[PDB]
Amino acid sequence: VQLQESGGGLVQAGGSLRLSCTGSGRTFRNYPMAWFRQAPGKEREFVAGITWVGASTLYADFAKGRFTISRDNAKNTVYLQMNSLKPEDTAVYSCAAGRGIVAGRIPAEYADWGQGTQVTVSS
Amino acid sequence: TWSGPGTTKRFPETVLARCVKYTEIHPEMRHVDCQSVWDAFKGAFISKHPCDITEEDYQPLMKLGTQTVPCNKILLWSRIKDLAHQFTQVQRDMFTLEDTLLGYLADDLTWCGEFDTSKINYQSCPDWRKDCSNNPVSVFWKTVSRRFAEAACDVVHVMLDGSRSKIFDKDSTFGSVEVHNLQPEKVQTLEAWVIHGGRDLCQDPTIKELESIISKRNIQFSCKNIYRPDKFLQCVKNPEDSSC
């Protein structure tokens, strides 16, 4: 599994982005997938997760009502719609593919990772 | 004399032997003293009228049975026991109620006492429709199911039998206890897997009822048709297969 993120960029507070994570090589249609983020001097933190059987979603408390995770198996891509962005959303956002059934919140339990895409929200 | 079948033969020895068996093999519960567990179980219903059992009667047992399970990997189920349990044998980080110590002790068993004796009634025990709802068996399952459902977080999964009339039954343990104890402060989504017996069953009126019950608690709902239970177990085991 090779993962590649795109869709990041520079926006004003209140703005929107749509991140996508496209899989080359092996399909990930039967893996749970998650978006994580990492601000300059901090540890990776869970943003959102999605299962593979029924594509059920899961969000960090800071993401609820603002971000939407989704996937499209045919395209081999996971999406993160981000609305109402704030400066403290500024970070490198990465997608990860896990194993088993559920999308957990612990980065070290995910096997495959992309390089990430920069998200910068100005004040 | 009650309408239901009596306490299962050799119930004391069976419960004790299940405790010994579970605790000696599952390392997370090795600390448990199985004699204490039995004494606490027995104390819940012995010398008590079997129509006046409360959850508090089972509290000492609940406490000995304390088990810190991963909240995010719970599989609930309804009228599809064998497949739900096969599933947790394949996807071994997930569990059903009956994969916990307390669920494992009581599974498929029946028990009650009498108000005027310290004896176990092997002749008959209350039937929940015909005699009384608040009997030793019903109250146990109601207590442990409620607590199990309260422990759940993140995405909770439920397996349902799609071959039967009332795929979701609001009068089942899942329908009347478990679903109303999923806390919205930590459960974000219930995912239903409707198992087929050889159409789109997620459209069935009873699934819409479940969706509605769940929506009102501010929890999201997903539903999935499992057409081929055999392929499903195979693909969960090895998702790298090109057939999935």
Residue numbers in the entry:
A (entry chain C): 2 to 124
B (entry chain A): 49 to 246, 251 to 296
Article excerpt on this structure:
CD38 is a 46-kDa membrane glycoprotein with a short 20-aa N-terminal sequence, a single transmembrane segment and a 256-aa catalytic carboxyl domain. Decades of research documents that it is a novel multifunctional molecule, serving not only as a differentiation antigen on cell surface, but also, most surprisingly, as the dominant signaling enzyme responsible for the metabolism of two intracellular calcium messenger molecules, cyclic ADP-ribose (cADPR) and nicotinic acid adenine dinucleotide phosphate (NAADP) (reviewed in Lee1). It is well-established that the C-terminal domain possesses all the catalytic activities of the enzyme. In this study, we have generated a series of nanobodies targeting three different epitopes on CD38, definitively identified by crystallography.
The crystal structures of seven different nanobodies complexed with CD38 were solved. Three separate epitopes are identified and are colored differently (orange, cyan or green). Consistent with the long distance between the epitopes and the catalytic pocket, none of these nanobodies shows any antagonistic effect on the enzymatic activity of CD38 (data are not shown). To facilitate quantification of binding of the nanobody to the surface expressed CD38, we engineered two fusion proteins by splicing EGFP or mCherry to the C-terminus of the nanobody, Nb1053, to create either a green (1053-EGFP) or a red (1053-mCherry) fluorescent nanobody. Significant fluorescence can be detected on the stained LP-1 cells with as low as 10 ng/ml of 1053-EGFP. We employed the bacterial toxin domain, PE38 as the toxin part, which has been used in constructing various immunotoxins, including LMB-2, which is successful in a phase II clinic trial. The construct of the immunotoxin is diagrammed in Fig. 5a, we used the hinge sequence of human CD8 to link the C-terminus of the nanobody (left, CDRs in red and FRs in blue) to the N-terminus of PE38 (right, translocation domain in magenta and enzymatic domain in red). The results show that all three MM cell lines are susceptible to killing by 1053-PE38 with EC50 values around 30 picomolar. The toxin was highly selective and did not affect the LP-1 cells not expressing CD38 (CD38-KO), unless at least 5 orders of magnitude higher concentration was used, indicating the cytotoxicity is strictly CD38-dependent. The results demonstrate that the engineered immunotoxin, 1053-PE38, selectively kills CD38-positive cells in a concentration-dependent fashion.
